[PDB]
Design an enzyme around this catalytic site. Structure first.
Site, PDB file in Angstrom:
ATOM      1  CG  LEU A   1     -77.567  27.165  60.745  1.00 39.70           C
ATOM      2  CD1 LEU A   1     -77.669  25.596  60.441  1.00 39.70           C
ATOM      3  CD2 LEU A   1     -76.565  27.864  60.059  1.00 39.70           C
TER       4      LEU A   1
ATOM      5  CD  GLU B   1     -74.356  24.085  52.595  1.00 42.23           C
ATOM      6  OE1 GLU B   1     -73.322  24.287  52.164  1.00 42.23           O
ATOM      7  OE2 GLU B   1     -74.643  23.633  53.808  1.00 42.23           O
TER       8      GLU B   1
HETATM    9  N1  NDP Z   1     -73.981  29.987  58.300  1.00 42.11           N
HETATM   10  C1  NDP Z   1     -73.110  29.073  58.587  1.00 42.11           C
HETATM   11  O1  NDP Z   1     -72.586  28.290  57.585  1.00 42.11           O
HETATM   12  C2  NDP Z   1     -72.592  28.875  60.006  1.00 42.11           C
HETATM   13  C3  NDP Z   1     -73.268  29.404  60.980  1.00 42.11           C
HETATM   14  N2  NDP Z   1     -73.197  29.399  62.324  1.00 42.11           N
HETATM   15  C4  NDP Z   1     -73.925  30.266  63.188  1.00 42.11           C
HETATM   16  O2  NDP Z   1     -73.104  31.382  63.634  1.00 42.11           O
HETATM   17  C5  NDP Z   1     -73.493  32.008  64.929  1.00 42.11           C
HETATM   18  C6  NDP Z   1     -72.435  31.584  65.823  1.00 42.11           C
HETATM   19  O3  NDP Z   1     -71.664  32.921  65.623  1.00 42.11           O
HETATM   20  P1  NDP Z   1     -70.741  33.505  66.882  1.00 42.11           P
HETATM   21  O4  NDP Z   1     -72.026  33.994  67.558  1.00 42.11           O
HETATM   22  O5  NDP Z   1     -69.670  34.343  66.435  1.00 42.11           O
HETATM   23  O6  NDP Z   1     -70.246  32.133  67.712  1.00 42.11           O
HETATM   24  P2  NDP Z   1     -68.697  31.533  67.667  1.00 42.11           P
HETATM   25  O7  NDP Z   1     -69.034  30.130  67.452  1.00 42.11           O
HETATM   26  O8  NDP Z   1     -67.595  32.333  66.929  1.00 42.11           O
HETATM   27  O9  NDP Z   1     -68.332  31.613  69.336  1.00 42.11           O
HETATM   28  C7  NDP Z   1     -67.762  32.822  69.559  1.00 42.11           C
HETATM   29  C8  NDP Z   1     -67.185  32.493  70.979  1.00 42.11           C
HETATM   30  O10 NDP Z   1     -66.087  31.420  70.566  1.00 42.11           O
HETATM   31  C9  NDP Z   1     -64.788  31.880  71.420  1.00 42.11           C
HETATM   32  N3  NDP Z   1     -63.999  32.605  70.331  1.00 42.11           N
HETATM   33  C10 NDP Z   1     -64.303  33.132  69.187  1.00 42.11           C
HETATM   34  N4  NDP Z   1     -63.155  33.594  68.725  1.00 42.11           N
HETATM   35  C11 NDP Z   1     -61.807  33.377  69.570  1.00 42.11           C
HETATM   36  C12 NDP Z   1     -60.844  33.344  69.522  1.00 42.11           C
HETATM   37  N5  NDP Z   1     -60.269  34.167  68.412  1.00 42.11           N
HETATM   38  N6  NDP Z   1     -60.085  33.099  70.506  1.00 42.11           N
HETATM   39  C13 NDP Z   1     -60.486  32.316  71.480  1.00 42.11           C
HETATM   40  N7  NDP Z   1     -61.745  32.016  71.435  1.00 42.11           N
HETATM   41  C14 NDP Z   1     -62.603  32.671  70.602  1.00 42.11           C
HETATM   42  C15 NDP Z   1     -65.948  32.106  72.357  1.00 42.11           C
HETATM   43  O11 NDP Z   1     -65.285  31.894  73.696  1.00 42.11           O
HETATM   44  P3  NDP Z   1     -65.691  32.159  75.168  1.00 42.11           P
HETATM   45  O12 NDP Z   1     -66.953  32.767  75.530  1.00 42.11           O
HETATM   46  O13 NDP Z   1     -66.010  30.639  75.644  1.00 42.11           O
HETATM   47  O14 NDP Z   1     -64.237  32.858  75.443  1.00 42.11           O
HETATM   48  C16 NDP Z   1     -66.663  33.281  71.886  1.00 42.11           C
HETATM   49  O15 NDP Z   1     -67.512  33.930  72.675  1.00 42.11           O
HETATM   50  C17 NDP Z   1     -74.853  30.843  65.363  1.00 42.11           C
HETATM   51  O16 NDP Z   1     -75.768  31.781  64.931  1.00 42.11           O
HETATM   52  C18 NDP Z   1     -74.329  29.729  64.515  1.00 42.11           C
HETATM   53  O17 NDP Z   1     -75.585  28.980  64.156  1.00 42.11           O
HETATM   54  C19 NDP Z   1     -71.800  28.733  62.731  1.00 42.11           C
HETATM   55  C20 NDP Z   1     -71.285  28.147  61.708  1.00 42.11           C
HETATM   56  C21 NDP Z   1     -71.544  28.053  60.391  1.00 42.11           C
HETATM   57  C1  D09 Z   2     -74.504  25.024  63.993  1.00 45.56           C
HETATM   58  O1  D09 Z   2     -74.498  24.129  62.693  1.00 45.56           O
HETATM   59  C2  D09 Z   2     -74.246  22.763  62.728  1.00 45.56           C
HETATM   60  C3  D09 Z   2     -74.793  21.745  63.505  1.00 45.56           C
HETATM   61  C4  D09 Z   2     -74.758  20.382  63.366  1.00 45.56           C
HETATM   62  C5  D09 Z   2     -73.560  20.120  62.571  1.00 45.56           C
HETATM   63  C6  D09 Z   2     -72.722  20.952  61.986  1.00 45.56           C
HETATM   64  C7  D09 Z   2     -72.797  22.268  62.222  1.00 45.56           C
HETATM   65  C8  D09 Z   2     -72.251  23.126  61.599  1.00 45.56           C
HETATM   66  C9  D09 Z   2     -70.948  23.988  62.375  1.00 45.56           C
HETATM   67  C10 D09 Z   2     -72.642  23.429  60.032  1.00 45.56           C
HETATM   68  C11 D09 Z   2     -71.674  24.487  59.338  1.00 45.56           C
HETATM   69  C12 D09 Z   2     -70.410  25.171  59.336  1.00 45.56           C
HETATM   70  O2  D09 Z   2     -69.783  25.818  58.407  1.00 45.56           O
HETATM   71  C13 D09 Z   2     -70.814  25.426  57.382  1.00 45.56           C
HETATM   72  N1  D09 Z   2     -70.767  25.616  55.986  1.00 45.56           N
HETATM   73  C14 D09 Z   2     -71.710  25.378  55.290  1.00 45.56           C
HETATM   74  N2  D09 Z   2     -71.458  25.467  53.944  1.00 45.56           N
HETATM   75  N3  D09 Z   2     -72.216  24.270  55.645  1.00 45.56           N
HETATM   76  C15 D09 Z   2     -72.539  24.068  56.915  1.00 45.56           C
HETATM   77  N4  D09 Z   2     -73.738  23.233  57.239  1.00 45.56           N
HETATM   78  C16 D09 Z   2     -71.948  24.529  57.892  1.00 45.56           C
END
Ligand code: NDP
Ligand code: D09
Length: 186
Positions: free
Chosen positions: A22, A30
């Site tokens: 993050l 949150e």
């Molecule tokens: N701000 C927030 O609320 C949230 C933030 N995050 C953050 O977002 C970032 C992660 O994003 P990102 O880098 O895009 O990672 P993702 O979690 O989307 O992972 C991407 C990977 O997921 C698989 N994948 C993605 N799309 C598909 C699809 N359509 N079909 C099959 N497999 C798929 C992977 O597999 P493979 O390489 O195994 O094929 C691809 O390399 C991190 O920095 C994390 O901390 C995550 C959740 C919430």
């Molecule tokens: C990599 O992060 C995490 C680490 C530990 C447990 C859960 C999450 C995730 C996937 C956290 C989230 C994924 O989408 C989200 N939207 C909102 N609004 N808040 C959040 N905390 C998340």
């Protein structure tokens, strides 16, 4: 099992994610909101289901995997077996969405949550059919790797209220944020 709910927290500049992490320090309160919403099913007996990209899955501390009391789907084109603790592996978002509507599952499953990564949010957001976006607005810019897709305001209605969602400005560790719900029908 049919509307797709995306849930994300987003910085002012649209940042989510920095170096597999993050952009901001832990917002623990949150996280509470994320847990209650993804976990809270609307039928006793049924669990909500979460779908996430593979990097999001391995970014959750292993002590928190799978996300508890939810059915956990991981997307990966390269894994062949589900990650340890994951309930299902699917090779595309479409596979995942087809599985969920299968009679054997649809009845164990209530709400479907897309909980990330950028890639998975983008794709969900190109779905026709009913979408909701539960967007935490972190009122502050943070330096980010990845970013959240543009929210097309011709396409998404901002709901003025939503059941169980509080609309007042919140704050934790000097960081202000608020909860929004958008909706794209059809
Ligand atoms: N701000 C927030 O609320 C949230 C933030 N995050 C953050 O977002 C970032 C992660 O994003 P990102 O880098 O895009 O990672 P993702 O979690 O989307 O992972 C991407 C990977 O997921 C698989 N994948 C993605 N799309 C598909 C699809 N359509 N079909 C099959 N497999 C798929 C992977 O597999 P493979 O390489 O195994 O094929 C691809 O390399 C991190 O920095 C994390 O901390 C995550 C959740 C919430
Ligand atoms: C990599 O992060 C995490 C680490 C530990 C447990 C859960 C999450 C995730 C996937 C956290 C989230 C994924 O989408 C989200 N939207 C909102 N609004 N808040 C959040 N905390 C998340």
């Amino acid at each position: 099992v049919r509307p797709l709910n995306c849930i994300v927290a987003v910085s002012q500049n649209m940042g989510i994610g920095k170096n597999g992490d993050l952009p901001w320090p832990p917002l623990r309160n949150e996280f509470k909101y994320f847990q209650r919403m993804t976990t809270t099913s609307s039928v006793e007996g049924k669990q909500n289901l979460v779908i996430m990209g593979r990097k999001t899955w391995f970014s959750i501390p292993e002590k928190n995997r799978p996300l508890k009391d939810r059915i956990n789907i991981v997307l990966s084109r390269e894994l062949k077996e589900p990650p340890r603790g994951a309930h299902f592996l699917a090779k595309s978002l479409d596979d995942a969405l087809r599985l969920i509507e299968q009679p054997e599952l649809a009845s164990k499953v209530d709400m479907v949550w897309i909980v990330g990564g950028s890639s998975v949010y983008q794709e969900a957001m190109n779905q026709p059919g009913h979408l909701r976006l539960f967007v935490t607005r972190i009122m502050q810019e943070f330096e980010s790797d990845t970013f959240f897709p543009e929210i097309d305001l011709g396409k998404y209605k901002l709901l003025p209220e939503y059941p169980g969602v509080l609309s007042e400005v919140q704050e934790e560790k000097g960081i202000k944020y608020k909860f929004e719900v958008y909706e794209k029908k059809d």
